Amino acid sequence: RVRKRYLRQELRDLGHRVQTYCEDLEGRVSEAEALLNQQCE
Amino acid sequence: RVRKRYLRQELRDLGHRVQTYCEDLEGRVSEAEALLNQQCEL
Amino acid sequence: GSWLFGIPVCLGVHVADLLKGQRILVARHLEYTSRDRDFLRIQRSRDLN
Amino acid sequence: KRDEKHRHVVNVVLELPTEISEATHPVLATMLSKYTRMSSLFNDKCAFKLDLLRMVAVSRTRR
Amino acid sequence: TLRTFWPQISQYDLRPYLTQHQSHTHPAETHTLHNLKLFCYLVSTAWHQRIDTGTVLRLSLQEFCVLIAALYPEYIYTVLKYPVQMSLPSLTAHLHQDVIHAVVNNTHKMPPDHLPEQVKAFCITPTQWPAMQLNKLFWENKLVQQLCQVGPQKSTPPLGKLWLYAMATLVFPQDMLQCLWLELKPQYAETYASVSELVQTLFQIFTQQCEMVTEGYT
Amino acid sequence: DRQPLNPANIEARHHGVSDVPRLGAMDADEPLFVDDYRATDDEWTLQKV
Amino acid sequence: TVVRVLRPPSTFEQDHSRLVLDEAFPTFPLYDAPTPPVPFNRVPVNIQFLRENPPPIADTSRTADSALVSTAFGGSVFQENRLGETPLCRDELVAVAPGAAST
Amino acid sequence: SFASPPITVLTQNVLSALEILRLVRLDLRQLAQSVQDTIQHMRFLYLL
């Protein structure tokens, strides 16, 4: 039971970390490409 | 045993889908950089 | 406004600000004056009736 | 934070002597970038030690 | 476009094109950057050949490049159509440095003494030229404001701006007005057709603003 | 182990890269690790003999 | 959209400005009876010109269509109309010169 | 002296976009490698 529990936290951690990487890359791309037209001054 | 086998199969199945999608993003960003720095034919 | 009131005006297109803004670059876009035969023609062609 | 996990992976799992640190090994730091990813396998420390050993070997070849 | 995108174009290399003699296969789309870099290279070699012979003004490559492009639009077409060997004498002879000095120092004079034919651009010193309020003669004057003050509510801004539009549309010939609407249409009126339909739409929205309600009396 | 190996179970051994989970699971039974290499039939005969 | 309005001042002092092109980017060295100068009597009216092939080192219809002679450009465009045809309507008093006008 | 806000909107340089896209590309490659390594690690550790 302990090993299956550990597997389930590892799977949840993988999901959370891939979501975090997706969000970080999305934010970085959106911020960097927004400067191309210079929306901010 | 049977649960482990099916989990193995389906997880290995999703790994290559992740690979295909990340390579699609690879190609899209490469095309974007190409069209930005130096316009190509067509 | 220039035609209706019969006053000249020169229209300019701003190109860019150069030399930290010491000079303003404007190309020759459009000029109005009694010199312009078009200007006199449009002044005479008005229907004030 | 990150300090506690790296202290674990250095002094409990890998068990480097104190005279070896991050500034002494670039490959060790670039590998700790990876080793902190997995929270399991922290009982078969011999595997991590051998992995670092072979990583140094592959890093030092002239080819 | 050249002023905005200059840093990218400035790094383009033209050595293989000029140094090699026989024609080499080149992409069809790559003409733009290559042609612009060639034109500005010819501009730079045009300026540098005539400096053999108060304030000293320092001009960077891009600023003088776009300036001389604006002065004569024939540079681009002449360069593209004719080779460099025959282009160099033409640019050497036509680079009237005194005209360049007059243009870069043109002020206090409008319209400039020189005709539109020979030159296409000039320059203005912002400090020397004061700014008026020409609206006070066109639509901010008292009489037109009083004539256009009549409106449904106090929140309506003065309608002299629309009043001059209505007078111009109704009086002047349609050919002139359609010529301008094709020439100098505003951004909001880009989708619109002409001046008369602009008046139509503005009158329609003015009628839409005011609505009627009937009530009975005892 | 208890059943004949499917092709998916035979994983590739590539050196240089860390490949730590393989080093962790060396005691394991089911997965069989191979070089990205195969012995030709003549070398097969020579080794056999 | 109008951004500024200016007036020419009555004061003047001759600038006598000496413009210098700061050679921040020196160009490539030039490598190999003077030829007649190429006339500057053609201005493009489109953008298709830049997509054409590079000039070979050392069509007239193309010149007629895209480029235009500066002589017809510099002159005034608006033209009047006479009374030969049956008396003309309001919009025919003033007309554009067909040669100068372009779509 | 100016009252209206100048230098409102113009296109910036392309080099910054190019380098940020190179970093995004490297991060994508790292993400692919890391997810593959993690799933393979889970397979070898728990799925045996």
Swiss-Prot record, chain B:
Assembly and partners? Heterodimerizes with CVC1. Interacts with major capsid protein/MCP and triplex capsid protein 1/TRX1 at the pentamer vertices. Interacts with the large tegument protein/LTP.
Q: Report what the protein is called.
A: Capsid vertex component 2
Superkingdom is: Viruses
Task: Tell me which family the UniProt entry assigns to this protein.
Answer: Belongs to the herpesviridae CVC2 protein family.
- Which gene holds the coding sequence for this protein? CVC2
The task this protein performs is described as:
Capsid vertex-specific component that plays a role during viral DNA encapsidation, assuring correct genome cleavage and presumably stabilizing capsids that contain full-length viral genomes. Participates in the interaction between the capsid and the tegument through interaction with the large tegument protein/LTP.
- List the subcellular locations: Virion; Host nucleus
What is the organism field in this record? Human cytomegalovirus (strain AD169)
UniProtKB/Swiss-Prot annotation, chain D:
Q: What is its main location?
A: virion
Q: Could you tell me the superkingdom of the organism this chain comes from?
A: Viruses
Q: Where are the transmembrane segments?
A: none
Q: Which GO terms describe its biological process?
A: viral process
Its GO CC terms?
host cell nucleus; viral capsid
Instruction: Provide the protein's localization.
Output: Virion; Host nucleus
Q: Which UniProt keywords apply?
A: Capsid protein, Host nucleus, Virion
What is the annotated quaternary arrangement, including any partners?
Interacts with the major capsid protein/MCP.
Q: Which family does it belong to?
A: Belongs to the herpesviridae small capsomere-interacting protein family.
Its biological function?
Answer: Participates in the assembly of the infectious particles by decorating the outer surface of the capsid shell and thus forming a layer between the capsid and the tegument. Complexes composed of the major capsid protein and small capsomere-interacting protein/SCP assemble together in the host cytoplasm and are translocated to the nucleus, where they accumulate and participate in capsid assembly.
Name of the protein this chain belongs to: Small capsomere-interacting protein
Native species of this protein?
A: Human cytomegalovirus (strain AD169)
UniProtKB/Swiss-Prot annotation, chain F:
Q: What is the lineage of its organism?
A: Viruses, Duplodnaviria, Heunggongvirae, Peploviricota, Herviviricetes
Cellular location(s): Virion; Host nucleus
Q: How does it assemble?
A: Homomultimer. Makes the hexons and eleven out of twelve pentons. Interacts with triplex proteins 1/TRX1 and 2/TRX2; adjacent capsomers are linked together in groups of three by triplexes, heterotrimeric complexes composed of one molecule of TRX1 and two molecules of TRX2. Interacts with scaffold protein; this interaction allows efficient MCP transport to the host nucleus. Interacts with capsid vertex component 2/CVC2. Interacts with the small capsomere-interacting protein/SCP.
Annotated protein name in UniProt: Major capsid protein
- Family of this protein: Belongs to the herpesviridae major capsid protein family.
Q: What does this protein do?
A: Self-assembles to form an icosahedral capsid with a T=16 symmetry, about 200 nm in diameter, and consisting of 150 hexons and 12 pentons (total of 162 capsomers). Hexons form the edges and faces of the capsid and are each composed of six MCP molecules. In contrast, one penton is found at each of the 12 vertices. Eleven of the pentons are MCP pentamers, while the last vertex is occupied by the portal complex.
Which species is listed as the source?
A: Human cytomegalovirus (strain AD169) (HHV-5)
UniProtKB/Swiss-Prot annotation, chain G:
| Entry superkingdom | Viruses
The coiled-coil regions, if any, are none
Where is the protein situated, by its record's location annotation? Virion tegument; Host cytoplasm; Host nucleus
Function statement: Large tegument protein that plays multiple roles in the viral cycle. During viral entry, remains associated with the capsid while most of the tegument is detached and participates in the capsid transport toward the host nucleus. Plays a role in the routing of the capsid at the nuclear pore complex and subsequent uncoating. Within the host nucleus, acts as a deneddylase and promotes the degradation of nuclear CRLs (cullin-RING ubiquitin ligases) and thereby stabilizes nuclear CRL substrates, while cytoplasmic CRLs remain unaffected.
Q: Which family does it belong to?
A: Belongs to the herpesviridae large tegument protein family.
SUBUNIT field: Interacts with host CUL1 and CUL4A; these interactions inhibit the E3 ligase activity of cullins. Interacts with inner tegument protein. Interacts with capsid vertex specific component CVC2. Interacts with the major capsid protein/MCP.
Q: What is the protein's given name?
A: Large tegument protein deneddylase
Per UniProt, what is the name of the gene that codes for the protein in this document?
UL48
